[PDB]
Design a protein around this ligand. Structure first.
Ligand SMILES: Nc1ncnc2c1ncn2[C@@H]1O[C@H](COP(=O)(O)OP(=O)(O)O)[C@@H](O)[C@H]1O
Ligand SMILES: Nc1ncnc2c1ncn2[C@@H]1O[C@H](COP(=O)(O)OP(=O)(O)O)[C@@H](O)[C@H]1O
Lengths: 443, 140, 449, 153
């Protein structure tokens, strides 16, 4: 399809027992990190129950230790039923709006309003339309329509005749009508009328006739975030700003009205509130002004749960000239719990490389897998995973059916790992541009 | 004025036609057996006032549209192993690219729904053009 | 015709086995890097993986930009090659991470088959019909237009929607014009006057055009190449409809906007439907970020999200820097000028400085490419400057020396013409010595420090 | 070709020349006929779709009056028959693989009663399959002088 293979495509979930929250040593694409995956499983329970508001969890650990992997596992195990918002901290630095507005919008995207609405909908194959134009048009008309089970004629009002002539409905068209509003959508064309469609090229697809009742009360479930309600109410076609993104700094009295309106709908039972989760990757890229905002944005009943990831040691907080653990001020870290991810053992590296090789289309000999595992221990899990693709392409060019040690060794020779590339810049120092800007171009 | 054509059996068909008692079915021998049955005077020896055919093989070069077509069509030879098709399809763009696919009134890609006509025949002479143009991004 | 720095590069010059020929396709050497760039080319043509990164790491002048240009030539014109410097990311209209996403999506192509459903003809008659609006305050409105279109084969009368008549009004159509009406958009194009009116005696240069051939009503099949960025932008600032928003959108100043991830995920679903309908095929390509050391820690942090995207392109980075300070992260130093965090994601292709004989061979390729003839003494003399100063410097001398030769009437450059070019046109280090020697003097004739 | 033809036709019409154009594709006679109507050139057409009385008269028209500049003429339907001796120029917009047919076409102009020196132009496109055509034709005409020479009788 459209969706290609990416770094995380193998992650299908958290790999955890739904009864006990015990993580399995490998399942759903996640290997190891068991203490961290158990803690992430407890956080999913908090999210799905919705009771607790504005918890902030930090996933802290070295690079390539599965902090994003666990975050993808949580997103995949919540599924489409819950708002999950994936923010890179670099995105808050908009030119369109202030940092705190961008953080408000991110929080507001992460609470859903869930609304259930019925419509009668009419769906069937068109047997016939006649229309009388006299000559101004649309004076009267009749629709005959069927399913495999039922056939009816309808007398049409003139605005339905305008809908029919707008959407060029003809005999054989399979249509649905949202009769609460009278938009008509041409679901397709019946195969039984294929020869009527003289203007349709050979690439044209055809459906079978619809089934059952011509009219059904379909029930639709909508989830709309608080941010969408905010943006709708910002200008005459404010919803367009959900796509073009040119929302200004939306005024807070609009949001306060909406908060009141949604609490009204909750108590009336017209709607339900669905608290989601905001994920902030590389949270250390936020500055001291962002953190002091987030402190108190977490205190609302309409706060999502927040989940954050950091690679950083004791490091300088942005927007100040002093250093703190994770790169985050202690003022903020007081309201956070930390989940820590560890480095992998060799058998965990072997398993992750195997899963990555099976998610890719790669037939991998046992000695190539052993070599890639040793490279993993010495050069890191990402570099070994990047060599899988490379070795497959080398093996394919020599027409080989399997990736052998020979192909991994070409890959290892052609593409340096970070440690070898660091050595390369240290040995090549006079030929590279140094931090003083000096370089020598001569032989 | 051109009896010899592609090959010699294709000459025998003309000789058999005139004398099927003689001809039925080493090249230097031919000139000595055709001599009773053929006569060919030639315009250097005859009508000398008709000065020779001045000739210019021009060796002109492709335009940008042609080579864009040509390369996409020449790529098919690399994919091969169909020249019985392609030599003519190449020759078509050698002559003019509108023979291959004619240039026409054009516009950007339209990223939207509209109701297309299913039948030209059943439309008739009088028709109402409604405004069907609609976004495929469809916020519910 | 015009010759630039890389005009001799034609490709990576690899065997079918994927091994570099020592001099091919304009290259000399870099054989290990050309072979690695060959495997990168095959990663791209496979169109199976998203979001792999490559670093071209090596000193200035070691052919990193030549290699990236060679990749673009190995891929050919079907695949999107999207080249930028890191300095291009710093937009004033939109946040820096927006232009990263735009360039990521320019790097992903789509080829799509489109049906234009269309009307054509000479306008034979044209007649509006009206609505008597009582209390709107804008007065009357026009309820439909009836228009007669005639082609060579047949004729129709169309009762147009008001918004299609507004398209005809914008196009200034009159009776006897030939027009085109794309029902996809409702747009109207005036093709010309009908050839039935072809006369010299109009002051204005009219397009007299023949009556359209075939039926008045047609369906045209067109194959279009678009990127995901073209779709994003089309739906962010709409201009295709005959509605009032589309109309005014054509009059307002063009403006980039911080397109939301909601629009991008919606357009993924639109494109996925074109793919499932079989009318489109995906053509994922590459983003080349030259000068990637000019990025900053916020850009690199954003790439950690962007490269996880399941339809991200392949990203090739070039850097020329040793241990250097990361921009926007002034306490942090790392190799290549790239954060250690993000460097773990890349495959690094190191490029190496040339030997004297490789430089001599590049001088000959480059002289042949600029179309200038040298003596072997001249080629040796230029190659000496390539060794002693810089490859770039010695290649810059070929064009001056050719003029200086031609000025003496000799068609072939010899050592005297390079000897003059050396003295007229200094390198960076001889110029730095003039600066340093003079800078002891103050007053009028000093250089300003 | 059509670019180089347009330049050549201008040089010829400013020269007062009169021209026969041969095509291997009749659809190219349609496209060429548009281009001619989009310019000042008076012209006539013959090909294998024309009826025989139209062939009679269009040849007679062309031979009658020097106002007609150009005579579009399909290679096989138009190469074989009658004199066209008030032309002076022959252009093969496309050249037959069988060189005999191009010879017949050329000698509809180069003929007894021919008014002026016939100049033949052939619009070969470099690097295309057209090169193979003209090579095959030139090989075949050499073979057709191996396999005969001399008066006969
Ligand atoms: N425990 C794991 N199980 C399966 N895949 C993993 C695991 N840990 C990491 N990976 C994979 O290895 C790569 C690097 O880990 P990632 O989570 O992206 O790094 P970081 O922790 O720096 O965000 C990713 O493609 C990820 O999917
Ligand atoms: N292997 C090579 N063969 C031929 N020309 C080269 C080679 N490497 C570099 N060049 C040329 O030398 C110049 C410097 O290379 P360039 O790619 O600009 O270096 P950088 O790595 O700084 O981009 C360019 O004109 C380039 O075309």
């Amino acid at each position: 399809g459209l969706n290609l293979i990416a770094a995380h495509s193998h992650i299908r979930g958290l790999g955890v027992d739904a009864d006990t929250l015990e993580p399995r040593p490998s399942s759903q694409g996640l290997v190891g990190q068991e203490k961290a995956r158990k803690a992430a499983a407890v956080v999913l329970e908090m999210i799905k129950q919705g009771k607790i508001a504005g918890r902030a969890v930090l996933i802290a650990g070295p690079p390539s230790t599965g902090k994003t992997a666990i975050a993808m596992g949580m997103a995949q195990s919540l599924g489409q039923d819950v708002p999950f918002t994936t923010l890179a901290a670099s995105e808050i630095f908009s030119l369109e709006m202030s940092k705190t507005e961008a953080l408000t919008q991110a929080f507001r995207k992460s609470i859903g309003v869930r609304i259930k609405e019925e419509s009668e909908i009419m769906e069937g194959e068109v047997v016939e339309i006649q229309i009388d134009r006299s000559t101004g048009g649309a004076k009267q008309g009749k629709l005959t329509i069927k399913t495999t089970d039922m056939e009816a004629i309808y007398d049409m009002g003139s605005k339905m005749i305008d809908a029919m002539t707008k959407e060029r409905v003809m005999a054989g068209d399979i249509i649905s009508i949202d009769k609460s509003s009278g938009k008509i959508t041409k679901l397709g064309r019946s195969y039984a009328r294929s020869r009527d469609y003289d203007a349709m090229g050979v690439d044209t697809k055809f459906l079978q006739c619809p089934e059952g009742e011509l009219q059904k009360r379909k029930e639709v479930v909508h989830t709309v975030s608080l941010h969408e309600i905010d943006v709708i109410n910002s200008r005459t076609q404010g919803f367009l700003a959900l796509f073009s993104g040119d929302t200004g700094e939306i005024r807070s009295e609009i949001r306060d009205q909406i908060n009141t309106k949604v609490a009204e709908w909750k108590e009336e039972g017209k709607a339900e509130i669905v608290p989601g989760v905001l994920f902030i990757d590389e949270v250390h890229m936020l500055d001291i002004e962002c953190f002091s905002y987030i402190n108190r944005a977490l205190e609302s009943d309409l706060a999502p749960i927040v989940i954050m990831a950091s690679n950083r040691g004791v490091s300088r907080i942005r927007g100040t000239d002093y250093k703190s653990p994770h790169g985050l001020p202690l003022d903020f870290l007081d309201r956070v719990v930390i989940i820590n991810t560890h480095p992998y053992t060799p058998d965990e590296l072997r398993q992750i490389l195997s899963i990555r090789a099976q998610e890719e289309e790669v037939d991998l000999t046992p000695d190539a897998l052993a070599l890639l595992t040793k490279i993993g221990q010495e050069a890191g899990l990402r570099y070994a995973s990047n060599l899988i693709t490379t070795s497959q392409l080398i093996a394919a060019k020599r027409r080989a059916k399997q990736v052998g040690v020979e192909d991994v060794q070409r890959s290892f020779k052609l593409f340096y790992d970070p440690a070898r590339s660091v050595r390369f810049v240290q040995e090549s120092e006079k030929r590279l541009i140094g931090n003083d800007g000096v370089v020598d171009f001569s032989y | 004025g051109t009896p010899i054509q592609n090959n010699m059996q294709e000459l025998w068909a003309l000789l058999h036609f005139i004398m099927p008692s003689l001809f039925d079915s080493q090249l230097k021998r031919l000139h000595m057996i055709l001599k009773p049955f053929m006569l060919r005077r030639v315009k250097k020896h005859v009508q000398k006032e008709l000065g020779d055919k001045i000739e210019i093989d021009v060796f002109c070069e492709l335009s940008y549209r042609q080579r864009a077509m040509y390369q996409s069509l020449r790529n098919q030879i690399s994919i091969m192993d169909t020249l019985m098709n392609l030599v003519m399809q190449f020759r078509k763009v050698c002559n003019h690219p509108d023979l291959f696919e004619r240039a026409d009134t054009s516009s950007p890609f339209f990223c939207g729904h509209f109701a297309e006509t299913g039948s030209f025949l059943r439309e008739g002479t009088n028709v109402a053009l409604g405004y069907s143009t609609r976004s495929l991004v469809e916020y519910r | 015709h015009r010759t630039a720095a890389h005009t001799h590069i034609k490709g990576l010059g690899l065997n079918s086995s994927g091994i570099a020929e020592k001099q091919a396709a304009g290259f000399v050497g870099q054989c290990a890097a050309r072979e690695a760039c060959g495997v990168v080319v095959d990663l791209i043509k496979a169109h199976k993986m998203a979001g792999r990164g490559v670093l071209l790491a090596g000193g200035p002048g070691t052919g990193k930009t030549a290699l990236a240009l060679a990749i673009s030539q190995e891929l050919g014109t079907k695949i999107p090659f999207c080249p930028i410097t890191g300095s291009e990311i710093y937009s004033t209209e939109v946040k820096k991470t927006e232009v990263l996403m735009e360039n990521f999506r320019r790097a992903i192509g789509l080829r799509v088959r489109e049906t234009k459903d269309v009307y054509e003809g000479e306008v034979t008659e044209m007649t509006p019909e009206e609505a008597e609006n009582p209390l709107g305050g804008y007065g009357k409105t026009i309820s439909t237009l009836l228009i007669g279109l005639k082609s060579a084969r047949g004729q129709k009368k169309l009762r147009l929607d008001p918004s299609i008549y507004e398209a005809i009004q914008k196009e200034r159509v009159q009776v006897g014009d030939v027009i085109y009406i794309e029902t996809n958009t409702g747009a109207c194009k005036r093709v010309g006057r009908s050839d039935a009116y072809a006369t010299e005696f109009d002051l204005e240069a009219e397009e007299y055009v023949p009556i359209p051939k075939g039926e008045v009503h047609k369906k045209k099949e067109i194959v279009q190449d678009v990127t995901l960025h073209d779709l994003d932008v089309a739906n962010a600032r709409p201009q295709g409809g005959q509605d009032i928003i589309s109309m005014m959108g054509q009059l307002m100043k063009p403006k980039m906007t911080e397109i939301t991830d909601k629009l991008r995920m919606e357009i993924n679903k639109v494109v996925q439907k074109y793919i499932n309908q079989g009318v489109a095929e995906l053509i994922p390509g590459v983003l080349f970020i030259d000068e990637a050391h000019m990025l900053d820690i916020e850009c690199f942090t954003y790439l950690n999200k962007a490269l996880e995207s399941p339809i991200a392109p392949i990203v090739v980075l070039a850097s020329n820097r040793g241990i250097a300070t990361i921009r926007g992260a002034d306490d942090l130093k790392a190799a290549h000028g790239i954060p250690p965090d993000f460097l773990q994601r890349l495959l690094i292709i190191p490029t190496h400085p040339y030997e004297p004989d490789e430089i001599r061979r590049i001088v000959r390729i480059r002289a042949q490419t600029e179309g200038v003839q040298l003596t072997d003494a001249a080629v040796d003399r230029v190659a000496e400057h390539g060794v002693r100063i810089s490859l770039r410097y010695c290649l810059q001398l070929l064009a001056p020396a050719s003029i200086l030769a031609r000025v003496n009437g000799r068609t072939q450059v010899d050592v005297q013409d390079i000897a003059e070019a050396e003295e007229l046109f200094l390198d960076a280090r001889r110029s730095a010595n003039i600066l340093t020697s003079t800078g002891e003097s103050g007053g009028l004739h000093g250089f300003i420090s | 070709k059509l670019a180089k033809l347009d330049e050549l036709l201008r040089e010829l019409k400013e020269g007062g020349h009169r021209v026969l154009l041969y095509f291997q594709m009749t659809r190219m006679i349609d496209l060429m006929e548009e281009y001619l109507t989009y310019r000042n050139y008076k012209y006539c057409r013959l090909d294998g779709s024309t009826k025989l009385e139209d062939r009679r008269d269009t040849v007679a028209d062309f031979q009658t009056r020097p106002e007609i500049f150009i005579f579009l003429l399909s290679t096989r339907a138009g190469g074989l028959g009658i004199n066209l001796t008030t032309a002076d120029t022959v252009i093969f917009y496309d050249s037959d693989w069988n060189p005999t047919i191009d010879s017949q076409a050329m000698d509809r102009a180069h003929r007894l009663g021919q008014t002026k020196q016939v100049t033949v132009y052939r619009l070969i496109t470099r690097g295309t399959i057209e090169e193979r055509i003209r090579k095959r034709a030139l090989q075949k005409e050499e073979v057709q002088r191996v396999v005969i020479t001399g008066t006969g009788s």
